[PDB]
């Protein structure tokens, strides 16, 4: 194939790219990298971060999942994943950047214990509540009646967050506390494109248990 994806069977950032390519109907070869022994192609294609995902189109590389997503949207414009109105597009980019900035709040879930881990989980619930109230509102998806780049960017809050919660022994995304966001997470996971393209939960839980063990 003319499109290659240097990926992973577990990274949520790689899954954002898989979803976008499948939504566009773009054929691609998935090259699963071993992060303990990175290939010559990965280091050549992404010299700045040496990380996956890396999309390679016509032999030219695009690194960083958020940059890859906008490249896919611009390259294959059919089945749009962003709105046409500039203000609506700015709101979508604003929420995507908000999610990208709050990564440190989720890290604390694998670094804190007891009366400190409860506080870290409460801080994550408040991050999600802002997203729920000001971002999702009463829509079925962040993209309205169907998923868009904003839903894709927040997909890591579904099975990956469920695995983090089970590995850390704390609750974050619950129906009592975040009713609309919890209903969104269920609806997103049930979209056939997402359902057919997510890691096996038991394998993902084992991976998150290892990451928590390393982060202590």
Ligand X SMILES: O=c1c(O)c(-c2ccc(O)cc2O)oc2cc(O)cc(O)c12
| Distance of closest approach, residue 210 Cβ to ligand X, in angstroms | 10
Return the residues of window 156-185 that contact ligand X according to CB under 6 A.
156-157, 160-161, 164
| Distance of closest approach, residue 179 Cβ to Cl ion, in angstroms | 27
Is residue 153 near Cl ion by the rule CB under 5 A? no
Residues constituting the chain: 216
Count of C-beta atoms within a 10 Å radius of residue 200: 11
Binding residue count for a copy of itself, defined by CB under 8 A: 24
For residues 4 and 27, the answer to whether their CB atoms sit within 8 Å is: no
Return the residues of window 48-67 that contact Cl ion according to CB under 5 A.
65
Which span (2-10, 66-74, 158-166, 196-204) binds a copy of itself, by CB under 8 A?
66-74
Residue 39, marked binder: no
Is residue 89 near a copy of itself by the rule CB under 8 A? yes
| Residue 59 burial by Cβ neighbours in a 10 Å radius (0-12, 13-18, 19+) | exposed
86: helix, strand or coil: helix
- Which residue number, 7 or 143, has a Cβ lying nearer to ligand X? 7
In 3D space, the residue among 214, 87, 92 whose CA is nearest the CA of residue 151 turns out to be: 92
Distance (Å, whole) CA 20 – CA 73? 8
| Distance of closest approach, residue 9 Cβ to ligand X, in angstroms | 9
């Amino acid at each position: 194939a003319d499109v290659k994806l240097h990926g992973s069977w577990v990274s949520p950032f790689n899954y954002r790219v898989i979803w976008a390519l499948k939504l566009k109907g773009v054929e691609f070869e998935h090259i699963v990298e071993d992060l303990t022994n990175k290939s010559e192609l990965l280091l050549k294609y992404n010299p700045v971060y040496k990380k996956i995902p890396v999309l390679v189109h016509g032999g030219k590389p695009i690194a960083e999942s958020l940059v890859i997503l906008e490249y896919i949207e611009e390259t294959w414009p059919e089945n749009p994943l962003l709105p046409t109105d500039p203000y609506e597009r700015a709101m979508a980019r604003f929420w995507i950047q908000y999610g990208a900035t709050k990564t440190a709040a989720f890290g604390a879930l694998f670094r804190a214990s007891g009366e400190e881990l409860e506080k870290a989980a409460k801080e994550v619930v408040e991050v999600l509540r802002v997203l729920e109230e000001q971002g999702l509102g009463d829509k079925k998806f962040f993209g309205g009646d169907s998923i868009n780049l904003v839903d894709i960017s927040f997909g890591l809050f579904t099975c990956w967050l469920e695995a983090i919660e089970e590995a850390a022994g704390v609750k974050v995304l619950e129906p009592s506390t975040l009713p609309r966001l919890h209903a969104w997470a269920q609806n997103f996971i049930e979209v056939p494109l997402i359902k057919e393209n997510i890691p096996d939960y038991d394998k993902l839980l084992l991976h998150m248990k290892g990451v928590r063990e390393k982060m202590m």
